């Protein structure tokens, strides 16, 4: 039941990397595409934070079909981090790790050596080092507490912190550890940087992105295989900045004529292997909304993601498969074909489910 990383309602992503790799440029490109801050009346959105809708053909279709009063797509929350003070980074679920694989041509800087692998080793080392500093401080705190308290939980926390210190000093990320559920629950309270899952974004000039080729990609791929097997997505920051500034008509003409497409949709939809998510929808005249929950969630746990009271008071879940609704075309048709189902406490929610939850007010 415990897993590394405490996913709640949507992913929070930190953009990390060395200076001058295009982090703030990527962030500004995503800001142009973002949900305005007025749509979150319960939240204060910091200046280096953007909320961007996850594009989903299913979500668009449901909104055409139900014509709801309000449309709430799934979204991603993205934070631009300036350098590697650490409150911003500790809070995120996962990391977009941006690598420089772009080089200038006729006008160049002296000794401006591009080496993505060298940069990978530098930043991954720096995250583990910040974890070693954090774990060092917590070991001191626990040892001081253990002078005063007899409590068994302190002896457990200490044994774990020392196992983690040794793992990190051996150059290994916490997320590649074999942690028992008891350890995972303690690790999750620490929010260690090397415990967070990663997507690698490889920043290329627009020619290399259009060509679908770069000399550094095989070297990056090889390193990533020996250090976790995480997703790699090539992009061009300069191309995405230009494309986001064009009008829809100009953008389409540019992409047709030059034979390339935006990487941003793929980047926004990719998510993380360690954080295995599915979408379910609520749909009606008032609202169509996309909900994000852990794969293999049971119906009452999906209700809990709306609010704990709907889980605790759960009675049943009336479910349509998105496929069933799409092919029959409307809810009356789905009911007539007997594909509108009453599901119970043991039902395992499926990606694309359209759910009408029933609960007891007390
Ligand atoms: N060639 C190239 N350089 C990049 C790219 N992305 C970033 N840079 C370089 O790094 C500078 C900072 O860009 P940011 O996007 O703020 O980088 P950062 O947040 O990762 O530190 C840019 O300065 P700038 O003032 O925006 O540009 P410039 O006028 O100084 O060259 C530019 O020199 C890219 O995709 N291609
Ligand atoms: Mg920056």
Residue numbers in the entry: 15 to 98, 112 to 389
Give excerpts from the publication.
AtYchF1 is an unconventional G-protein in Arabidopsis thaliana that exhibits relaxed nucleotide-binding specificity. AtYchF1 in Arabidopsis thaliana is a close homolog of OsYchF1, which possesses a noncanonical G4 sequence (NxxE) within the G domain, instead of the canonical NKxD in most P-loop GTPases, resulting in a relaxed nucleotide-binding specificity and the ability to hydrolyze both ATP and GTP. Similar to OsYchF1, AtYchF1 was also previously characterized as negative regulator for both biotic and abiotic stresses. OsYchF1 harbors a G domain at the N-terminus for GTP and ATP binding and hydrolysis, and a TGS (ThrRS, GTPase, and SpoT) domain in the C-terminus for nucleic acid binding.
